[PDB]
Amino acid sequence: SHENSNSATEGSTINYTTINYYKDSYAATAGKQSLKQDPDKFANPVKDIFTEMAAPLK
Amino acid sequence: SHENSNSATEGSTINYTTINYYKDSYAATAGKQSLKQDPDKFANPVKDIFTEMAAPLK
Amino acid sequence: GDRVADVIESSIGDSVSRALTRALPAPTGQDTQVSSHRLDTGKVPALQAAEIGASSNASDESMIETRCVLNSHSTAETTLDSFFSRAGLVGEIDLPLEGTTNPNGYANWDIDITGYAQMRRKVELFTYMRFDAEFTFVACTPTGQVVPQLLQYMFVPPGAPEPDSRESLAWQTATNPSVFVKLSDPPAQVSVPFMSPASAYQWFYDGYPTFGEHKQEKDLEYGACPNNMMGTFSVRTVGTSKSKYPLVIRIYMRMKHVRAWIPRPMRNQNYLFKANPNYAGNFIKPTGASRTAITTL
Amino acid sequence: GDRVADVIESSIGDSVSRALTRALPAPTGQDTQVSSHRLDTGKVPALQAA
Amino acid sequence: SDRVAQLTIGNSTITTQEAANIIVGYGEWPSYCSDSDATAVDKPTRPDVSVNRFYTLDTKLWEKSSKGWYWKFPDVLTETGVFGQNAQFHYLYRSGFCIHVQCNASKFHQGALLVAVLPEYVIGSVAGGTGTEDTHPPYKQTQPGADGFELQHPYVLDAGIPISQLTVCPHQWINLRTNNCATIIVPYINALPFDSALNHCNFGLLVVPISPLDYDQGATPVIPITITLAPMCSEFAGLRQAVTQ
Ligand SMILES: CCCCCCCCCCCCC/C=C/[C@H](O)[C@H](N)CO
């Protein structure tokens, strides 16, 4: 089970579970990702965040 | 897992990881080598080594 | 018994090799350190002396002002296995229905890997090699179609009787290894060990195999290394009568478990003969490309 | 905030003047010491380089 | 210091005052064969001081249009002194070498020499010019002896291999501006613990002028080149009668 660390997703925060039979790590299966989202990075990219209950402009 | 010790790289300093299904050890895979270099043996084959900062001929 | 001082204190017999250099692990490229300006006399790393025979050892940090780079580029792909463990064509055997080359339905191919330039240039970068092999036999007709034919391959080590016909008795293979395979099947693949009487194959051999007068007839012995003569590879179509299809066989070799010694300059001329470094004398060409002037691109 | 090595280890901003020389008090002229002959090789104070 | 040197071995001594250090071939000193690597059963002989000494073979003239020369080892010594006698009388052979090349001129002469050691230096032929002829080098070209032989195509080294890459081999430069001598120490190079000293040649020594010799009219025009060499840690085995070749 000693193989090269040469997949496209090495040096990433999330870890997969995959099956490999060769010494090169990019030959493995796609596997399962981890379910994490950051919707604010596109939906609410403001400097000073404001609460729902108030008026955005005051 | 009892096999003959008849590969081409027996009696060598470096060890490999390989996969074999037969009793002869030269039928296995190429595997992974170890990453060691001796560049001085070709680049700096002098008797008395000299520092970078000085003059080679004094 | 040693009693004289020059024998007691003698250094004869030291069988260990004094090594001036040692191997150090290097999984990635070397990092770059921070550097600053320097204005002083007596300490000059820019000036060298190429006469000694050593490569100049001035680095980046001693010549220009540099930043710190954390180099993580792997060196794994330039190893000997990574460079050599790739298959390539080394021989072709032709089995025509009518012809003068192999008219009887059988052929003998002496095993040598200096028949094709792509493999020969790669293997001749070094002087000695010790490796294992992996041979693959791809068979097809001249139009490239696959047909229901049964073939036999036989490995004949030196000293064994070479077959002389398709009905020769040597095909009983009581001791020689052999392969029976059909063209409809995937190509045959076998693994071969290191077979030299010496510790390595040498692609260059500056000598003759025998003593005696070196006359004109006894001149081809130059460069002929007996230790690289590994026997013959014999092929035939199984049957008592003549076959129905003309067949072509291509052999592919893949090295593994490699060790190499004594690098030498790469070839820059066209090859002419096998096991013979001769070159066309009247048609010598430069190693690289040329340009009109030295001051222009 | 400094995070890169070439900024952390940088020498930019040194406002102090490096002085190779220092002032020493000299109220009177310098005295003369006793001297004798010298006959040796390698040590020559007469020869200079202007 | 570094520019001055003195090499003493056996009953001979070489002094120099314009050295450029010493090159050790592949970073390894010559040595004897160990008990785990030897294969023959008889006891080899080690004559020691009578064979390990400096031999001066011959002198060559450097001109403005010279192309180069090569020498084969140990063919240069197969017929010189006690070493030659032992090499003729015995079947096996094993030794290293210490090569010193002498070439001196004035401060008003210029030029450069490349001195290199190439193992298994097989010499190829011109193949009849067009290349359809299967020729092999004659005896005087493959085994020139102690008199050396001159290169015909120094750009290819008579083997189809470029001279620009000859520096991957153990080498030194003789640049008349800086030095006037070169020293390379070669261990035993072979795939066999012992080999014949008469049939097999281990390596070849190349001396090719990369920068042409040039001087003004009136200066000395005769600039010789000299080769001096000493076997190191010599062994011999398989004693029988002597054979000429
Ligand atoms: C039934 C098996 C048939 C396949 C036979 C293949 C065996 C090949 C023999 C060993 C090959 C060794 C590799 C090359 C060695 C020598 O250096 C070359 N001849 C160089 O000329």
Buried-state track C249-266, b at ≥16 Cβ within 10 A, e below 16:
bebbbbbbbbbbbbebbe
- The answer for E75, left when phi > 0, alpha when psi is -120 to 50, beta otherwise, is alpha
- Please, how many CA atoms are within 13 Å of residue A38, restricted to the half-sphere of its CB? 3
Q: Are strands E12-16 and E181-186 parallel, antiparallel or unpaired?
A: unpaired
Distances (CA, A) of A8 to A23, A28, C27, C78: 15, 11, 19, 21
**What are the residues facing C93 on neighbouring strands?**
C249
Instruction: Provide the residue range defining the domain that includes A22.
Output: 1-58
Residue count of chain B, please give it. Answer: 58
**Are the C-beta atoms of E95 and E78 separated by less than 8 Å?**
no
Q: Among candidates E193, E182, E181, which has minimal Cα distance to E104? A: E181
Using DSSP, state whether E205 is helix, strand or coil.
Answer: strand
Handedness of CA C260, C266, C271, C277 (dihedral sign): negative
Residue count of chain D, please give it. Answer: 50
Mutate to test the interface with C, among E72, E143, E161, E184 (most CBs of C within 10 A): E161
List chains adjacent to chain A, taking adjacency as at least 3 C-beta pairs closer than 8 Å: B
**AA letter at E2:** D
Distances (CA, A) of E43 to C193, E33, E96: 33, 12, 20
Place of tokens 């059909």: C182
The span from the CA of E44 to the CA of E239, in Å, is 9
**Are the C-beta atoms of E22 and E185 separated by less than 8 Å?**
yes
**Are the C-beta atoms of E133 and C280 separated by less than 8 Å?**
no
Decide if C21 touches B, using CB distance below 8 A: yes
**Are the C-beta atoms of E151 and E123 separated by less than 8 Å?**
no
**AA letter at C221:** E
Burial class (CB in 10 A: 0-12, 13-18, 19+), C107: middle
Phi, psi angle pair for C156, to nearest 5° = -110, 105
Q: Does C178 sit in the ligand 1 pocket, CB within 6 Å?
A: yes
Q: Does C181 sit in the ligand 1 pocket, CB within 6 Å?
A: no
* E74 upstream amide cis, omega within 30 of 0: yes
Using DSSP, state whether B12 is helix, strand or coil.
Answer: coil
Handedness of CA A30, A33, A37, A38 (dihedral sign): negative
Contacting residues of A for B29, CB less than 8 Å apart: 23
Using DSSP, state whether C178 is helix, strand or coil.
Answer: strand
User: Residues 19..58 of E with a Cβ closer than 8 Å to B: which?
Assistant: 20-27
Count A/B contacts: CB-CB distance under 8 Å. Answer: 6
The span from the CA of A16 to the CA of A29, in Å, is 10
**Are the C-beta atoms of E116 and E197 separated by less than 8 Å?**
no
Q: Does C251 sit in the ligand 1 pocket, CB within 6 Å?
A: no
Buried-state track C123-155, b at ≥16 Cβ within 10 A, e below 16:
bbbbbbbbbbbbbebebeeeeeeeeebebbbbb
Q: Give the distance (Å) from ligand 1 centre to CA of residue C230.
A: 6
Q: Among candidates B39, B34, D41, which has minimal Cα distance to C76? A: B34
Residue B57 to residue E2, Cβ atoms within 8 A: yes
User: Residues 210..229 of C with a Cβ closer than 8 Å to E: which?
Assistant: 210-211, 214, 219-220, 222-223
The span from the CA of C178 to the CA of C160, in Å, is 14
The span from the CA of C51 to the CA of E3, in Å, is 12
**What are the residues facing C130 on neighbouring strands?**
C259
Pocket test for ligand 1, best of C108, C119, C230 (most atoms within 8 A of CB): C230
**Are the C-beta atoms of C153 and C181 separated by less than 8 Å?**
yes
Please state the domain count of chain B: 1
Q: Among candidates E114, E92, E95, which has minimal Cα distance to E103? A: E114
Give the DSSP H or E segment for B43.
helix B40-43
Method in brief = cryo-EM
**AA letter at C265:** P
User: Residues 17..76 of C with a Cβ closer than 8 Å to D: which?
Assistant: 34, 36, 67-68
Residue C17 to residue E135, Cβ atoms within 8 A: no
Residue D5: closest C-alpha in chain C:
C68
Q: Does C131 sit in the ligand 1 pocket, CB within 6 Å?
A: no
The span from the CA of C263 to the CA of E167, in Å, is 11
**Are the C-beta atoms of C267 and C287 separated by less than 8 Å?**
no
For chains D and B, having 3+ Cβ pairs within 8 Å is answered no
Q: What is the 3-state secondary structure (H, E, C) of D1-50?
A: CCCCHHHHCCCCCCCCCCCCCCCCCCCCCCCCCCCCCCCCCCCCCCCCCC
Q: Are strands C232-237 and C106-110 parallel, antiparallel or unpaired?
A: antiparallel
Structural domains for chain E: 5-239 (2.60.120.20)
- The answer for C161, left when phi > 0, alpha when psi is -120 to 50, beta otherwise, is beta
The span from the CA of C61 to the CA of C33, in Å, is 7
**AA letter at C173:** T
Atom of ligand 1 nearest to the CA of C154: 1
Q: Rounded to the nearest 5 degrees, what angle is found at the Cα of E232, between the Cα atoms of E227 and E233?
A: 165
What lies within 8 Å, CB to CB, of C181 at 6+ separation is C137, C150, C151, C153, C188
Q: Does C179 sit in the ligand 1 pocket, CB within 6 Å?
A: yes
At how many Å resolution was this determined?
Answer: 3.1
Query: How many CB atoms neighbour CB E49 within 10 A?
Result: 11
Residue C269: closest C-alpha in chain E:
E160
Q: In terms of C-beta distances under 8 Å and separation of at least 24 residues, what long-range contacts does E34-38 make, across chains too?
A: E34/C15, E34/C16, E35/C15, E37/E193, E38/E193, E38/E194
What lies within 8 Å, CB to CB, of C94 at 6+ separation is C101, C102, C107, C248, C249
Give the DSSP H or E segment for E86.
helix E81-89
Contacting residues of E for B42, CB less than 8 Å apart: 26, 168
Phi, psi angle pair for E228, to nearest 5° = -130, 140
The full DSSP string for C114-142 is: -SSHHHHHHHTTSSEEEEEEEEEEEEE-T
Decide if C130 touches B, using CB distance below 8 A: yes
- The pair of structure tokens assigned to E186 is 């070669």
Mutate to test the interface with C, among B3, B9, B14, B23 (most CBs of C within 10 A): B9
